[PDB]
A paper describes a structure:
The malonate (a poor inhibitor of AtzC) adopts a planar conformation in the structure and packs against Trp309 (less than 3.5 Å away) as well as interacting with Lys65, Gln160, His219 and Asn304 (2.8–2.9 Å, ~3.2 Å, 2.6–2.7 Å and 2.5 to 3.0 Å, respectively). Oxygen atoms from both carboxylates of malonate are within hydrogen bonding distance of the water bound to zinc (2.4 to 2.8 Å) for both instances in the asymmetric unit. The bound water is also within 2.7 Å of His249 and Asp303 as well as close to the bound malonate moiety. In the malonate:enzyme structure presented herein, additional electron density was found less than 3.5 Å from the malonate, above the plane and above the water molecule (about 4 Å) bound to the zinc ion. This density has been modelled as dimethylsulfoxide (DMSO), which was the solvent used for inhibitors and substrates which were used in both soaks and co-crystallization experiments. Although a malonate bound AtzC structure was obtained, the structure of AtzC with its substrate or product was elusive, despite concerted efforts. Although malonate is a weak inhibitor of AtzC, the high malonate concentration used in the crystallization trials likely prevented other small molecules from binding in the active site.
Residue numbers in the entry:
A (entry chain A): 2 to 403
B (entry chain B): 4 to 403
The structure:
Amino acid sequence: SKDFDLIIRNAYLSEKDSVYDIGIVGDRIIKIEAKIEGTVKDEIDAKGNLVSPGFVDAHTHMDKSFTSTGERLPKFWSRPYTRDAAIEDGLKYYKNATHEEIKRHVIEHAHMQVLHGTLYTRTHVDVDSVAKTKAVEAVLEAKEELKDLIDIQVVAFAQSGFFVDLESESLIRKSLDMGCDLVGGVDPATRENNVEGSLDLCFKLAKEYDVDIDYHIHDIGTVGVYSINRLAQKTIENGYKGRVTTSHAWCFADAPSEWLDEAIPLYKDSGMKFVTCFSSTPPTMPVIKLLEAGINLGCASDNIRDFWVPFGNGDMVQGALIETQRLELKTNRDLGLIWKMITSEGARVLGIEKNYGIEVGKKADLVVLNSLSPQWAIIDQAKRLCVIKNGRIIVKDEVIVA
Amino acid sequence: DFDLIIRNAYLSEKDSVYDIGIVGDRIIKIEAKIEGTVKDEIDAKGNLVSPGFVDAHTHMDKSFTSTGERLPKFWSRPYTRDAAIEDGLKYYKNATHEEIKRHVIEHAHMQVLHGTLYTRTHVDVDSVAKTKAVEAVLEAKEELKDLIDIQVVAFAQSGFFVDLESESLIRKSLDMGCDLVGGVDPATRENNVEGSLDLCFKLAKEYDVDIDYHIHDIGTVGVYSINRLAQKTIENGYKGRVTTSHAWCFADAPSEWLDEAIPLYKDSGMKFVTCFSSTPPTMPVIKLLEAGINLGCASDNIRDFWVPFGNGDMVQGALIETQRLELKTNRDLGLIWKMITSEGARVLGIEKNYGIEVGKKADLVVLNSLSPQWAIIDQAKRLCVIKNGRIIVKDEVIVA
Ligand SMILES: [Cl-]
Ligand SMILES: [Cl-]
Ligand SMILES: [Zn+2]
Ligand SMILES: [Zn+2]
């Protein structure tokens, strides 16, 4: 009987630089107008504040999150981080971890994300000889139970290395067969000790299940740049343009700048996408340079409260503040670039850009903020007012009401 | 018996949970259980209770001047020091005593809501501001004494040798009651390192005040300038009475320059403050701390023409430092917690009355987190803030 299922009144829209009413029917934005007349079931008044599309946390580890919790001090952080140690910690952990513990962590992680207005995430999940597909199974189960809260892509993740743990290949195939959405490895050079082999193997598996690729490349300096360049060239050779993401690419921060300058056309040609996580972005990462060159660069938590990262609130607005401090940004323009990173850049990384944004016909997945603008939100860190997924209110005043 | 009791307080220095009994502005008893009941109690419920945070470097006078539009004002252009100086001279031309006092009070309220109970603010003194900003700050200070303790640095923002009115104005500012004196960039602002430093000492000594110097200059010219400062500190009988703010040069100068200078800094008792709005990612924070250097922490500017950020929140500042510096271990987060607490106290000179021990001041923050590490990680809002043994903040409202 009624003209709109939901109307958000008085919404400041950063892309249009003005205040509008937003009219929603079902899971779709139907109308954006200075003032909407018509009958409506439910309304939310944004009161002139910013309303944003849902945030995108383009790289998480939901499977092993919150494992540092339960004592006065974070567990595991009596010692400094190294990749190989954190790998051994993970193999020890998954020996006895239960399906229910892992599913609980994934749900807790998702709840924390959605409370902060993240509506889309791409999680990695550990696949190795100890975890087997136990973690994958729990993640895919949770995913299904969370589908009214948050959209999740799952990367089948060969955390130990295809050429280090030889069971990885069979187990990743199974993980893909089970329904993982992407495949990925780690450090073709310093973990695998076999750049060409590891990358070729990832493409073989990807192609078998017709999935996209998200690769963890931590390696610094010229060995990092070399490894991403090999990845990018293989992307072209395999007919995989636009289907490959490189996570981290810390090497862009310490390799000679001329190495990045030479590789940019290759990245554009291959449609290589990137993710920088705010838990590790190097201070001298050329974020603004990448963005100005037209490179797709999303943003993410990475791990939350585990034996890799003790931090994490699953909050992209807090992450955006963290980036501005890491990178030493202040201008309104630069804060605006960070805001695109946690929104529309992420959407592009995830491949959802056609249905993402506050425009007519797009999905009604939205966050009403308590701040005036992207810049003021990053600065003031005000809590979210309301979160809307599939045109239904799922968070109101710091509670999940879905 | 007790005016206030905090129940079930985790104390990080003792690594256990205690009841805390308070009479007047003093902590009187710390025991596993305090027998009996009193009118005013706060239950920490096993979470951390901390001494009040110390924001060792602010600019309360010109805070919140970027506010009032959809986008922050001023930030259509990148920062440089000399441009921010011009912005400040333009702003203070017409800024009123009441606007400035209002911003100071807003800033204080924001700080105390996050559990900061002690701050050292600089205040612009130059030919345009004159002592108008000084006046307003001292006036707000007096009105805020039940909320927060404020030290005021008479700050020659434009340079003693660039704005020649600075000297006379700073003398007046001290006469009016500023607690400290300071300048900026002896080398690249003043173009006279010996002169500027000697002048600051002359003025300091006339009014028997401490020194807090802004030294942003990077690399070897920064280290040189801090070294000249520290030598002059010894020459002037000023050991322990001088702080150097920023010292960004420690980050990019050859590490052997800092290694050579450390004994000089220890000999001179030089104190330092690194502000979480600019700490360079390669600043050798942990190195300084392990060498026993006193290194406090601070907001610097909040929402103005120098820095667009700021929530006046030292716990958020601590998280920012861990990200700038790439820290993760429980030990390192512990060190950052000392920076926002007891290191600050030592910078400000209030260490004897600072801490959660019997006989110390009942200036306390009850957190909603288990531990210093968990508080930096989870960023939970403060539950209760106590100043001079009186509850001033409860659940995000100032109730004083
Ligand atoms: Cl950048
Ligand atoms: Cl009271
Ligand atoms: Zn990761
Ligand atoms: Zn300052």
